[PDB]
Design a binder for this molecule. Structure first.
Ligand SMILES: Cc1cc2nc3c(=O)[nH]c(=O)nc-3n(C[C@H](O)[C@H](O)[C@H](O)COP(=O)(O)OP(=O)(O)OC[C@H]3O[C@@H](n4cnc5c(N)ncnc54)[C@H](O)[C@@H]3O)c2cc1C
Ligand SMILES: [Cl-]
Length: 488
């Protein structure tokens, strides 16, 4: 008889899950497993992202209960848990989605070697990305494309992505009863209070496949908006209704299928011949995701500067004061401090909002290494993706993929073009809620009478700007030019 395990790590969904379909096919018992490390708190991670993962597991649990099954949250590490449950559950086949992250490759290798010892077949379909990213490299001659212009030419010659897999059966084979490692009191989905987190989550985006599908349908309620989508024209100061899809935390955890997303975009594009094209279109945004996965997975030390071949070695400063002020949202620039406040409260910011604070920290004003900023984003971002965060940080720091270091965003002017009243600032920085719009982006320029009228005396209620942009900008640019000449 066939008893199988469908191992969840990413791909926290039931739709377009070929690993789940193979695990259920001709199976008497199916053990849906997510492996949790309860000492992951002795190692970094905000309660916002970890609760998003927990809500995603709860959604999977309710979805499995509706089909006569159950989600098992096994505690411990994979290398110690699987050799036990292989013999206990009579497992003959192990199934999980392919992953290309460095720790995943080291982890999945040992798991496979442990399965071959137990006589367990391992099935690992590709479903987290649009294509077999190792196939794109081989199709291109054996190296990853380093520009989006050439990558888009490759995917057009490769063809349409594989279509999404059908939905699993309305009923699935349940786990066998009275198995000790399957005891419900030891395999339930924990809450954020039981894993050690002491402060509650504040983000407004809920995890789970159900929410991922609802956000997808909501974005497709207006097909003209999807067809004419242009990423650089979207509004970074929009928070009540964000200007983009906000599907990144669901695509990160695999709550939403990228191939399903891509399949729905082609349906709209076929009936809208004037639809936007890469790199600005919605489909182009998925290609940016696939692009950085293709390069990042084939580039050693991709998340670091030293040892990274595609990354420029720049003599960034070691300034713990600029990092702390930027990290704690007290730079003195309300546009920057509001975005960093949205980071710690929501775990998500608009793409151009991240451009502002990444440029401010790195090549624009403070000249701190993008590795330091990447560490801060990885902690608070609910959509933190190993390859995407690092690639866009090297982009904004002009260390890879991007070279126009003379283009420096203004922490004073950039936001005023969209939100002249500072509604985005007043929402996240409530201490500036009564400051007139003439000085909301420059509170230090307000007369002292006006500062007292608003209850925001610069230096007492809100900090003074840690740097003068005009001076700090002309100093980072000059050092970037020197770095770019010594970069050969
Ligand atoms: C410094 C910096 C760090 C970033 N860190 C990450 C990260 O760790 N995780 C993350 O998901 N995004 C990250 N990005 C990308 C971008 O800011 C977000 O992907 C985007 O804002 C998410 O909003 P959305 O889902 O509405 O995007 P949409 O505009 O709706 O795009 C749709 C999807 O395409 C992908 N996508 C969009 N923009 C990019 C991009 N520039 N690069 C790669 N894929 C993209 C995402 O999967 C996104 O969900 C970062 C950007 C910056 C500037
Ligand atoms: Cl600007």
């Amino acid at each position: 008889v066939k008893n199988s395990i469908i191992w969840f790590r990413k791909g926290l969904r039931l739709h377009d899950n070929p690993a789940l379909l193979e695990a259920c096919k001709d199976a008497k018992h199916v053990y849906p497993v997510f492996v949790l490390d309860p000492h992951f708190l002795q190692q970094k991670v905000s309660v916002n992202r970890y609760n998003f993962l927990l809500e995603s597991l709860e959604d999977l649990q309710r979805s499995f209960q509706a089909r006569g099954s159950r989600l098992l949250v096994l505690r411990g590490k994979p290398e110690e848990v699987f050799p036990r449950v292989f013999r206990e559950w009579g497992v003959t086949q192990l199934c999980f989605e392919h992953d290309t992250e460095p720790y995943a490759k080291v982890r999945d290798a040992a798991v496979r070697r442990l399965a071959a010892e137990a006589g367990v077949e391992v099935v690992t379909p590709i479903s987290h990305t649009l294509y077999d990213t190792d196939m794109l490299v081989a199709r291109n001659g054996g190296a990853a494309p380093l520009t989006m212009q050439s990558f888009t030419k490759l995917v057009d010659r490769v063809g349409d992505p594989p279509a999404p897999a059908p939905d699993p059966p309305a009923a699935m084979p349940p786990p066998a009863e009275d198995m000790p490692s399957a005891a419900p009191a030891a395999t339930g989905v924990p809450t954020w209070q039981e894993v050690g987190f002491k402060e509650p989550p504040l983000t407004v985006f809920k995890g789970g496949e159900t929410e991922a599908l609802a956000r997808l349908e909501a974005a497709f309620q207006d097909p003209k908006w999807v067809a004419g989508f242009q990423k650089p024209d979207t509004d970074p100061s929009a928070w009540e209704k964000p200007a983009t899809t906000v599907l990144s935390p669901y695509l990160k955890f695999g709550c939403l299928s990228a191939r399903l997303f891509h399949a729905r975009l082609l349906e709209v594009y076929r009936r809208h011949p004037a639809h936007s094209q890469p790199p600005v279109s919605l489909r182009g945004q998925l290609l940016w995701r696939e692009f950085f996965y293709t390069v990042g997975s084939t580039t050693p030390n991709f998340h670091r500067m030293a040892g990274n071949p595609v990354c420029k070695q720049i003599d960034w400063d070691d300034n713990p004061e600029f990092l702390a002020a930027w990290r704690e949202a007290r730079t003195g620039f309300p546009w920057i401090d509001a975005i960093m406040t949205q980071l710690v409260t929501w775990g998500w910011m608009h793409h151009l909002a991240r451009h502002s604070v990444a440029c401010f920290l790195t090549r624009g004003d403070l000249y701190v290494s993008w590795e330091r900023g990447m560490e801060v984003f990885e902690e608070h971002l609910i959509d933190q993706d190993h390859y995407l965060n690092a690639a866009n940080w090297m982009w904004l720091s002009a260390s890879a993929f991007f070279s126009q270091y003379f283009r420096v965003y203004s922490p004073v002017v950039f936001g005023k073009k969209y939100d002249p009243e500072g509604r985005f600032i007043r929402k996240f920085l409530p201490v500036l809620k009564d400051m007139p719009a003439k000085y909301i982006y420059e509170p230090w320029t307000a007369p002292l009478e006006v500062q007292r009228k608003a209850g925001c005396v610069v230096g007492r209620d809100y900090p003074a700007p840690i740097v003068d942009h005009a001076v700090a900008s002309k100093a980072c640019i000059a050092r970037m030019a020197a770095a770019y000449r010594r970069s050969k």
